[PDB]
Subunit: 115 residues, 4 copies
Amino acid sequence: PLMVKVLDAVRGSPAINVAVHVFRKAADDTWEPFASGKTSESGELHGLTTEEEFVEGIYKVEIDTKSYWKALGISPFHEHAEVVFTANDSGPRRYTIAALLSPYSYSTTAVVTNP
Amino acid sequence: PLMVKVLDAVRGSPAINVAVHVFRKAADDTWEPFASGKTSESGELHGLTTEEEFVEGIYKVEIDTKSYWKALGISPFHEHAEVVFTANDSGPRRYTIAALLSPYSYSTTAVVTNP
Amino acid sequence: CPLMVKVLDAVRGSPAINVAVHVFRKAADDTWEPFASGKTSESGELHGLTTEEEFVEGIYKVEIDTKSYWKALGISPFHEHAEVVFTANDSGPRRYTIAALLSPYSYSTTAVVTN
Amino acid sequence: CPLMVKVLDAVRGSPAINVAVHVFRKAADDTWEPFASGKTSESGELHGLTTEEEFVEGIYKVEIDTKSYWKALGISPFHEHAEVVFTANDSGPRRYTIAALLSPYSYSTTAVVTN
Ligand SMILES: Oc1c(Br)cc(/C=C/c2ccccc2)cc1Br
Ligand SMILES: Oc1c(Br)cc(/C=C/c2ccccc2)cc1Br
């Protein structure tokens, strides 16, 4: 029920091997690690979680954009791109979080579907 | 070798039933109709052309954003979103043209791959 | 002046300076006629394109010479240019800012319309 | 002042007015400490956050209260807020504008860094 897709606006290509960390806000208001992975050759990251595991909550998807641009030898502006949202509060949904990256800019969007 | 994908930033959903017209610049510098179609329930439009047909040239992909927002009962700013590019000039490539729409804004990106 | 164009560079994190911009108005025969042009300043802005008297209701196209901009920086871009096509409407607010954010394979644009 | 934040609304084509913005600086213990805050003006801009003397090199986070903005307009948004996290570096240019373009399910941000 959670997928992340990352594109590179400079190359005109998927952003491959981008690290992604997902957190969920805990009872005590701290960010607990939830899941993590790397985008594939398609710029997609699948398999982060299951419908059982992905309960209601406030989630933070951290896309490690600085590490991505540095691995490419470029000095970018942002430390990371974060997307913070409440999920599954009217029941289970499927979420795609897409991000389009440039060295000094990013854009993100969500696609939310009801299975 | 040509796909168009359109997302809606207001709904958080694919932009469905968006009309798309493709033109190719002719010998005489006019825009000749090349192909057209509508996005599906996934916001994707497949099947516009073939690798034989999609020769080198300058192409214009016109995404009919006004008609999309009007069909939804909304008065938007732009008449359409255009993406104009040279294609296949170093041999055949696969192109995805993605666009993310709001009533007073759009963003577009290209993903170009070599099969 | 009721129309201003602002262009930014997402790669360098700067105003896009000395970008040619041409504005056209749609004529009764559906051709585009030249209306105004200039080059962006050091702030990435192009002021003084027109006056209230001249800027009547109608369909306008703002063409931004993105290809020359990228080539002058030694970067190969995807698009031939960026175009923004819209209707000016006297029942809306009176001042239009057309803003564009440029990357080699992507651009984003928005309108800020105010009184 | 070396730091300005500008927020725009992609749905209405306007400045995003009276949006709360909080700036934090990363402390030696890795916690975020409050640094500056304010509300955007009628132009969507927040000036006067800090001074040159106070704005030393370091990691800063700009948090934008997008959720309250959309709810005040009667719109259900996706994100809890928008955050922009970056390093201020004295070897780069001296003035930082953080610009954000808001839609209910999307946002785009860019940095314009100039001398
Ligand atoms: O499967 C795709 C593809 Br192909 C492109 C996108 C493009 C997303 C995007 C475009 C402009 C600004 C922000 C995100 C999203 C998804 Br989902
Ligand atoms: O005066 C400005 C500044 Br400074 C930045 C912008 C940024 C616009 C923008 C940001 C993200 C995507 C598309 C456009 C617009 C204006 Br009018």
